[PDB]
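New here. Your pick:
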Amino acid sequence: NPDDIVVLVGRKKSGKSYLIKHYFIPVLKAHKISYIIDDHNLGSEYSKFGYNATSLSDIVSKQYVVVYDRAKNDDFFEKLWQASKLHSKKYGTTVLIIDEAYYHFKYKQKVTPAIDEALHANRHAGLGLILSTQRVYDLMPIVYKQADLIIMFYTREPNELRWISKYISAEAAEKVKTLKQYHFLIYDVNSQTIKIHKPILEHH
C-alpha cells in the first residue's frame, strides 16, 4: 500500500484534500511512513503536515516535507523526483503526494525519464504516489493503467464518463454518476473491483 500509485479524481470541493488529510495521511503516520507533499503555491493548506521546504536538500533531509512548487524551472519534476528518491534512501518507503497532478503528468506531454520511472518503476524507487486531479481526462492515460487504486468522486460530465469507460471501467462510469456528495468510488485496478465508500469524517 505505501508504494501503491493512487489517483484521486473530482472537481473542486469534491473532498479530495480532506481525503488526503483525514484518510491517507493519518494511515501513513500510524505506520511510520514518511511523505512529501507537492503543493502548487508560493500559504498552502498543508503547512501543519510537514517542514516548509525551501530547497531540494530539505526534501531529502526532512522526514515530513511540504514542497512549495511555484515559479520553478520547467524541469522541476525531475528534480523533485531525484530528491524524493534520495529522501526514500534515508527514510524508507515514502509517499509523494501531488495536489494537482496535471502539472507533472499532463495528457499529451513528453514522457521524460522521471515520468517513466514514476509510472513503471516506482516500487523499486521506493516511492508511492498520490496524484490528485480535477478532471479525469487531464492526465496521461498510462497513469490509469499503472495505478493500483483509482478513487473517483461524483461527475456527470460526458467526456469524463467516456474516459472512465475507456481507460478504467464501464461499470465505474455508470456508478460515478449517482454518487452523493462526499461519497467516493474506489476502483481497484488490480482486482478490477469497485467499492462505494461513505463520506470520511476522521481517522480512527
